[PDB]
């Protein structure tokens with residue numbers, strides 16, 4: 001038993017991180033097959049990053065302008081191209097540690113493992129959720145650009161995120177592996193704001209089911225609610241609406257605990273209107289929304 | 304910026320996880336060089352685990368009773384010995400993925416990364432802190448025994464934990480890599496209860512230093528205190544007493560901020576005696592105690608490996 005923010009084992013990705021240097025700008029790259037993926041602002045200088053004409057800056061670059069280091073060996077760039085915000089450096093050597101992989105675009109509310117890296121060296125691993133406003137709440141410092149987020153199914157690594165930016169509020173933004181940003185952000189050196197940060201309701205309910213599966217039921221109550229009446233209150237608190245598909249996804253957790261989804265919604269509605277006083281749920285004083293129903297099923301099934 | 308419970312990259316440990324099976328009992332083991340370490344109760348059957356005599360049970364076992372598998376590839380066992388609650392099996396193959404490593408026994412309050420494993424396959428990684436009652440708030444299912452906890456310093460993997468037990472309260476217990484349990488627990492199929500837990504003071508202070516580094520310093524006061532005075536007061540609030548090693552590991556954060564350790568102790572004492580007064584620290588009204596000073600430095604100045 002127990003419930004914990006859990007990331008996938010990172011070994012398959014560690015063998016793909018490399019360092020990419022252009023002029024005086026260094027960040028991380030992802031070496032899969034004979035291609036190295038990294039954020040395209042590596043080609044920028046401190047002055048270019050203010051308003052970079054990336055296609056203009058790119059054509060002016062030569063293959064030898066890119067220093068790609070994989071551990072100790074230095075890889076030979078035999079080609080360069082650009083797919084949106086992701087720079088694609090073709091190398092003369094295919095990464096032998098390339099696992100089975102696929103590029104996917106995560107949906108808001110879904111989770112993934114972040115492998116934070118600096119100078120091409122993996123430094124830490126943690127779990128994140130793609131928030132409804134397409135930001136994530138990570139831990140990234142100078143030099144973390146190029147770090148990727150991923151999920152692992154069987155032996156297939158599904159890459160979904162490459163890090164680019166830290167907003168003035170302290171949350172983070174990035175792209176999928178096709179170079180398309182999550183959210184309305186742009187890779188220029190400017191202070192940018194996200195949309196309003198709504199709460200992932202289906203995850204909050206999953207996390208409440210986890211608390212019950214782990215012996216905590218102080219927030220439960222005898223009231224019930226309709227889907228619509230719950231969503232009225234939820235939206236009033238800047239919570240995403242609960243769809244019937246969300247209800248269906250919570251099915252397994254409902255059966256296991258014996259608490260109907262709409263019954264859990266009545267508890268959550270009371271928590272939102274009353275607060276938690278001084279009490280805690282699974283050790284937290286706030287309502288956690290970065291746990292998916294699948295995260296809870298994985299850890300609490302059969303407990 | 305940002306603060307998260309962050310585990311070490313697990314690749315160096317993944318290449319060392321294997322499956323050990325005796326009869327029908329299976330669990331995980333740690334393959335380093337030509338030795339596999341695992342919990343000794345793998346020799347037990349379901350009924351044996353009730354009141355086991357491990358010396359008597361082990362005498363009836365031979366090298367050929369042990370199934371050790373890397374994936375689906377068996378590693379022939381050519382030797383076996385018992386050290387405390389850890390079984391050691393010599394195999395005929397030296398793990399080519401063996402990293403630089405050492406075995407360490409950590410202290411309460413220290414943190415490590417747990418490699419959750421099932422049937423020898425790594426499944427998840429997450430950070431834990433050894434509680435002052437020698438339990439960890441883990442996430443472990445059936446078949447998780449033999450999962451190890453580790454830290455990575457440079458290129459050296461320091462193994463400090465091997466999983467054995469889930470207590471009734473849902474927390475977890477286990478040993479170091481020499482088979483010595485953390486806390487007053489024994490590997491028997493019986494409900495055991497840990498001592499009353501307490502808050503990890505040195506980590507709370509580190510958390511406060513983290514706040515000061517980030518401009519949130521409303522809680523600093525003009526008071527100071529002695530180490531003995533603070534310890535006697537902290538014990539009244541369920542806080543662990545500080546050691547000399549605790550003051551020392553707070554050294555870097557103390558120098559970086561300019562706040563002496565005993566001054567921040569006096570500030571924490573204020574927070575315990577009068578509460579938070581409706582305010583928060585780093586966004587939370589709850590004092591966090593699972594971040595060590597190293598974790599705080601690690602996330603304010605990203606170290607690599």
Ligand SMILES: *[C@@](O)(CO)[C@H](C[C@H]1CCNC1=O)NC(=O)[C@H](CC(C)C)NC(=O)c1cc2c(OC)cccc2[nH]1
Pocket residue numbers: 026027041049140141142143144145146164165166167168172186187188189190191192304
């Ligand atoms: C990459 O490492 C750079 O290669 C970096 C991410 C780091 C920075 C510290 N925290 C992180 O997560 N990304 C950046 O520095 C990006 C670069 C653009 C894509 C060109 N910009 C920002 O993070 C950025 C610019 C800001 C600004 O305007 C100057 C105001 C406020 C915040 C802000 N952040």
Ligand SMILES: *[C@@](O)(CO)[C@H](C[C@H]1CCNC1=O)NC(=O)[C@H](CC(C)C)NC(=O)c1cc2c(OC)cccc2[nH]1
Pocket residue numbers: 001329330344352443444445446447448449467468469470471475489490491492493494495
């Ligand atoms: C190992 O996986 C078994 O090899 C397992 C730990 C797992 C199982 C679910 N959660 C975990 O952390 N360990 C056990 O099952 C141990 C085995 C002993 C070392 C022999 N037992 C317990 O953890 C145990 C026995 C208990 C009991 O007695 C019947 C009452 C209450 C709790 C309890 N836990």
